[PDB]
Design a protein around this nucleic acid. Structure first.
Ligand SMILES: [K+]
Ligand SMILES: [K+]
Ligand SMILES: [Mg+2]
Ligand SMILES: [Mg+2]
Ligand SMILES: [Mg+2]
Ligand SMILES: [Mg+2]
Lengths: 180, 179
RNA sequence: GGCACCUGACCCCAUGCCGAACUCAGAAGUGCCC
RNA sequence: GGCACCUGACCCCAUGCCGAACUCAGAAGUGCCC
C-alpha cells in the first residue's frame, strides 16, 4: 500500500513534528484520523437526477459509497418545503483517505484558476480543519462538477492533534496550500 | 455517590495541569472506561447459577453483563462450538465513577492484609490492570452464591498517552499503590 | 439550515454489555458553507 | 486459554458511508488473570 502522501507523513512530516514540539513517544505525534466529505443539496434544487449525479461522481473521486443524509423532523408545511434526502456523506479513513487527499491537494486544487490557497484560519479550536469547496474538482478518475447544481461540499479534516497550531503544522508540512 | 468525579474535576484536573503543564484543559488525561472480566465458577456448565451470577455482577456494576464464549469454529467431529467462559461489563461515565468509588471505599478496604496495588501493572500506553481474586469484598454477593463466580480482571483505560501520566492520574484520584 | 468538532439523552432509535458505536438533542459553544 | 492495549482484515461477520463500531485475526508484541 505505497501511497505518496502517506509516505511523506512518516518520512518527512512525522520527524519534523517531533522536532517542533518534541514528542516523547512516536504515538503522541499528531496523525490524520478521518476526512468527512459532505455534499449537501440545500433544497435550492430538487430534481431527483441531482442526488444521483452527485452520488455517483462523489463515489468515484473518493472510491467509497456515499450515504444519503436525510431531513429529520418536518418543517414549514406549505406543500413544497422539506424533501427527505438532504445530501451525501462519506467518511474516509486509512488508505482511501491518503489517496483522496493526494488527489485533492496535488491535482484537483491546483488545476483551478480561482485559487490562491487555503485559509489557514479555518481551524475549529480542537485540532481539526474545515474546508468548503464550490468549484469544479478535477480528479484522475472523473471530474466533480456540480458547481451550478449543488452548493459546496463540506470537507472536515479531523486529526489527533489537540490544538490548532499542531493541526496546521501537520497540514502545512503535509502539503495543504494555505496562505500562511 | 459520584464524589470521585467531583474530586477529579475539582482536585485532580488542576493538580495534573500543574504537574505536567497542560496548556489546554482537554489535554489533561481522564478515565475513558473500565472493563470488568469475570471468569466462571459454579455458574459454569449450568443455567441457573449463571443467572444468579450475572444478576450478581449486574448489581455490583449497575449494568447488564455480557457473556464471553469460546469462538465457533468446529473441526470435523461436531460437538458444538464453545460455551460461556465468563462475563464482561464495560463501564463508562457515571456507572464507571460509582464503581471506582465502591472499589476503593468499600471493596479494597474489606481486604485483609492488603498491601496496595502494584504500581507496575501499567500496560505501556497509559492503562492499568488488576485482579481481585477472592471475594467477600462486595456487599452485594449474597451468601449461598459466592463460588458461582471466580475472580475479576479489571482494566482501567485512560486518555493518558503514557504510564507516567496515567499513574499520576490514578495516584491523585486515590488509588493505594504499593510502590 | 447543513457537515465537522464539543457536550449531552427529555424524544425516535440503539448496545452479544457499554448513548463507545448507531440514533436523537443543543438561538445565546467552536470552525466552515448556503 | 480469558479480558484490556496494540496492529491488522472481505476467513465468519459488519458499516444510512466508514474493519470508526460490530466480527474475526495476530507463538516469536505490552499489561493483568497462569
Ligand atoms: K457523543
Ligand atoms: K482495532
Ligand atoms: Mg483533533
Ligand atoms: Mg491510554
Ligand atoms: Mg440507532
Ligand atoms: Mg459483526
Amino acid at each position: 500500500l505505497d501511497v505518496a502522501l502517506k509516505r511523506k507523513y512518516y518520512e518527512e512530516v512525522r520527524p519534523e513534528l517531533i522536532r517542533r514540539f518534541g514528542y516523547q513517544n512516536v504515538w503522541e505525534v499528531p496523525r490524520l484520523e478521518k476526512v468527512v466529505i459532505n455534499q449537501g443539496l440545500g433544497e435550492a434544487k430538487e430534481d431527483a437526477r441531482i442526488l444521483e449525479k452527485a452520488a455517483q461522481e462523489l463515489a468515484l473521486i473518493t472510491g467509497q459509497k456515499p450515504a444519503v443524509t436525510r431531513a429529520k423532523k418536518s418543517i414549514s408545511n406549505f406543500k413544497l418545503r422539506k424533501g427527505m434526502p438532504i445530501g451525501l456523506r462519506v467518511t474516509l479513513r486509512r488508505d482511501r483517505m491518503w489517496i483522496f487527499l493526494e488527489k485533492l491537494l496535488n491535482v484537483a486544487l491546483p488545476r483551478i484558476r480561482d485559487f490562491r490557497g487555503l485559509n489557514p484560519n479555518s481551524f475549529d479550536g480542537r485540532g481539526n480543519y474545515n474546508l468548503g469547496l464550490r468549484e469544479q474538482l478535477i480528479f484522475p478518475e472523473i471530474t466533480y462538477d456540480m458547481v451550478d447544481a449543488l452548493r459546496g461540499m463540506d470537507i472536515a479534516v479531523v486529526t489527533t492533534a489537540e490544538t490548532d497550531e499542531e493541526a496546521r503544522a501537520l497540514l502545512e508540512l503535509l502539503g495543504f496550500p494555505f496562505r500562511k
